[PDB]
Design an enzyme around this catalytic site. Structure first.
Site, PDB file in Angstrom:
ATOM      1  N   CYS A 150      -2.004  -0.640   7.144  1.00 36.52           N
ATOM      2  CA  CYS A 150      -0.731   0.282   7.473  1.00 36.52           C
ATOM      3  C   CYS A 150      -1.532   0.795   8.997  1.00 36.52           C
ATOM      4  O   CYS A 150      -0.827   1.819   9.082  1.00 36.52           O
ATOM      5  CB  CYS A 150      -1.956   0.899   5.832  1.00 36.52           C
ATOM      6  SG  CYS A 150      -1.367   0.446   4.297  1.00 36.52           S
ATOM      7  N   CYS A 168      -5.909   1.361   6.478  1.00 35.22           N
ATOM      8  CA  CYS A 168      -6.304   0.531   6.398  1.00 35.22           C
ATOM      9  C   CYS A 168      -5.725  -0.103   8.119  1.00 35.22           C
ATOM     10  O   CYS A 168      -4.474   0.479   8.713  1.00 35.22           O
ATOM     11  CB  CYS A 168      -6.481  -0.944   6.015  1.00 35.22           C
ATOM     12  SG  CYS A 168      -4.814  -1.867   5.342  1.00 35.22           S
ATOM     13  N   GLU A 181       0.933   3.696   1.775  1.00 31.14           N
ATOM     14  CA  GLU A 181       1.816   3.800   3.309  1.00 31.14           C
ATOM     15  C   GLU A 181       2.668   2.360   4.101  1.00 31.14           C
ATOM     16  O   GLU A 181       3.823   3.524   4.207  1.00 31.14           O
ATOM     17  CB  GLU A 181       0.514   4.229   3.661  1.00 31.14           C
ATOM     18  CG  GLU A 181      -0.738   5.021   3.817  1.00 31.14           C
ATOM     19  CD  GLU A 181      -1.684   4.071   3.113  1.00 31.14           C
ATOM     20  OE1 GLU A 181      -3.131   4.089   4.350  1.00 31.14           O
ATOM     21  OE2 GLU A 181      -1.475   3.985   1.958  1.00 31.14           O
ATOM     22  N   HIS A 231       0.789  -1.609   0.177  1.00 35.23           N
ATOM     23  CA  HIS A 231      -0.167   0.158   0.082  1.00 35.23           C
ATOM     24  C   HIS A 231       1.050   1.326   0.361  1.00 35.23           C
ATOM     25  O   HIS A 231       1.754   0.982   0.119  1.00 35.23           O
ATOM     26  CB  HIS A 231      -0.578   0.575   1.274  1.00 35.23           C
ATOM     27  CG  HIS A 231      -1.983  -0.602   0.834  1.00 35.23           C
ATOM     28  ND1 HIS A 231      -3.115  -1.044   2.005  1.00 35.23           N
ATOM     29  CD2 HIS A 231      -2.568  -1.840   0.560  1.00 35.23           C
ATOM     30  CE1 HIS A 231      -3.757  -2.062   1.669  1.00 35.23           C
ATOM     31  NE2 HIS A 231      -3.267  -2.372   0.825  1.00 35.23           N
TER      32      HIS A 231
HETATM   33  N1  LIG Z   1      -2.480   2.242  -0.713  1.00 35.74           N
HETATM   34  C1  LIG Z   1      -3.482   1.687  -0.487  1.00 35.74           C
HETATM   35  N2  LIG Z   1      -3.674   2.577   0.611  1.00 35.74           N
HETATM   36  C2  LIG Z   1      -4.901   2.706   1.200  1.00 35.74           C
HETATM   37  N3  LIG Z   1      -5.906   1.817   0.829  1.00 35.74           N
HETATM   38  C3  LIG Z   1      -5.882   0.925   0.039  1.00 35.74           C
HETATM   39  C4  LIG Z   1      -4.791   1.025  -0.970  1.00 35.74           C
HETATM   40  N4  LIG Z   1      -5.026  -0.183  -1.317  1.00 35.74           N
HETATM   41  C5  LIG Z   1      -5.805  -0.528  -1.319  1.00 35.74           C
HETATM   42  N5  LIG Z   1      -6.918  -0.604  -0.281  1.00 35.74           N
HETATM   43  C6  LIG Z   1      -7.833  -0.467   0.297  1.00 35.74           C
HETATM   44  O1  LIG Z   1      -8.751   0.492   0.683  1.00 35.74           O
HETATM   45  C7  LIG Z   1     -10.137   0.100   1.048  1.00 35.74           C
HETATM   46  C8  LIG Z   1     -10.609   1.463   2.180  1.00 35.74           C
HETATM   47  O2  LIG Z   1      -9.553   1.681   3.233  1.00 35.74           O
HETATM   48  C9  LIG Z   1      -9.618  -0.994   2.397  1.00 35.74           C
HETATM   49  O3  LIG Z   1     -10.008  -2.219   1.658  1.00 35.74           O
HETATM   50  C10 LIG Z   1      -8.129  -0.775   1.566  1.00 35.74           C
HETATM   51  O4  LIG Z   1      -7.843  -2.568   1.492  1.00 35.74           O
HETATM   52 ZN   LIG Z   2      -3.100  -0.214   3.879  1.00 35.83          ZN
END
Ligand SMILES: Nc1ncnc2c1ncn2[C@@H]1O[C@H](CO)[C@@H](O)[C@H]1O
Ligand SMILES: [Zn+2]
Ligand SMILES: Nc1ncnc2c1ncn2[C@@H]1O[C@H](CO)[C@@H](O)[C@H]1O
Ligand SMILES: [Zn+2]
EC number: 3.5.4.15
Lengths: 157, 157
Positions: free
Chosen positions: A85, A82, A54, A52
């Site tokens: 993260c 999430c 973060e 991700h």
């Molecule tokens: N880089 C990312 N950063 C934040 N949320 C992500 C990212 N990639 C996928 N998601 C998804 O976005 C949704 C909202 O946080 C969650 O289902 C999460 O898993």
């Molecule tokens: Zn995340």
């Protein structure tokens, strides 16, 4: 100064989704108004579901500063982090988190219903204490609109 | 087959401590009965606070299988996965988690109180699907002994 770096995180989200690196998510790690890391989601580029925005920003900032704690650093996320993260932000010892959009804006375009209890203060075992600021007004509106704007440019993961 | 792979994760914890890669934690990801990843904590080696054993094993398994989902695979963790690691396990879509020692065993030797509500079933916003098994008997004894055996042979982080 919060607006500038949240803006940069949102632009990282757009850039990452346009180059196909991953989803529309960005993160900027800053050290007393010096940008230490500027990253976006790299799940597709890296074949790594933990990459991700973060987490990627934390990895790059720690490698750049040659230490595993970012206690004098702050993190700007285009989206509410999430559970993974937020746990990473905790482990990194980052002292402040500013985030742009509520997780619901990302969920609305089909992302998983995956929200960090410790961030919203809804846990029994995990309790956070780091300074958390949800942006409002201008930057919040832009950060929320990212998801409707990028819906057809990437495949959900 | 569970005891074999849990013991391999514990062995990884011992190796990682012995060569200074990180703390006393291991993780083994298997596909039916073939090990696809075998890792330990790499925080000190990588200067990466996200490089817990479970996250490392997830990344290496995803590289070995050339995909971002591990829905046909299971993970064995020497210690109850943290919020970051349990969130990564959720995102990776592993179908089963077997873990060795309760988090309290690691807290007892100086690691932070950092427990996953969703793993213990006290989450509100985070709800997990995967099958979870806490080892007992010999596997639990081995996993718990990890912390007494290594308690001052590594640098805490
Ligand atoms: N880089 C990312 N950063 C934040 N949320 C992500 C990212 N990639 C996928 N998601 C998804 O976005 C949704 C909202 O946080 C969650 O289902 C999460 O898993
Ligand atoms: Zn995340
Ligand atoms: N590789 C690791 N795997 C699991 N837990 C770890 C690891 N490294 C440090 N810990 C810490 O051990 C404690 C017990 O889960 C938590 O504070 C957690 O952050
Ligand atoms: Zn962990």
């Amino acid at each position: 100064s919060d607006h500038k770096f949240l803006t940069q995180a949102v632009e990282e989200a757009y850039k990452g989704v346009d180059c196909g690196d991953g989803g529309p998510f960005g993160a900027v790690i800053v050290h007393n108004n010096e940008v230490v890391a500027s990253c976006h989601n790299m799940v597709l580029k890296y074949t790594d579901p933990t990459a991700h925005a973060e987490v990627t920003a934390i990895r790059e900032a720690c490698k750049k500063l040659n230490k595993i704690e970012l206690s004098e650093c702050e993190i700007y996320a285009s989206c509410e982090p999430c559970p993974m993260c937020f746990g990473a932000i905790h482990l990194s010892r980052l002292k402040r988190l500013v985030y742009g959009a509520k997780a619901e804006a990302a969920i609305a375009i089909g992302f998983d219903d995956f929200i960090a209890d410790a961030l919203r203060g809804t846990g029994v075992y995990q309790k956070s204490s780091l300074e958390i600021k949800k942006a409002d007004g201008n930057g919040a509106a832009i950060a929320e609109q990212v998801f409707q704007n990028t819906k057809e440019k990437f495949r959900l993961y």
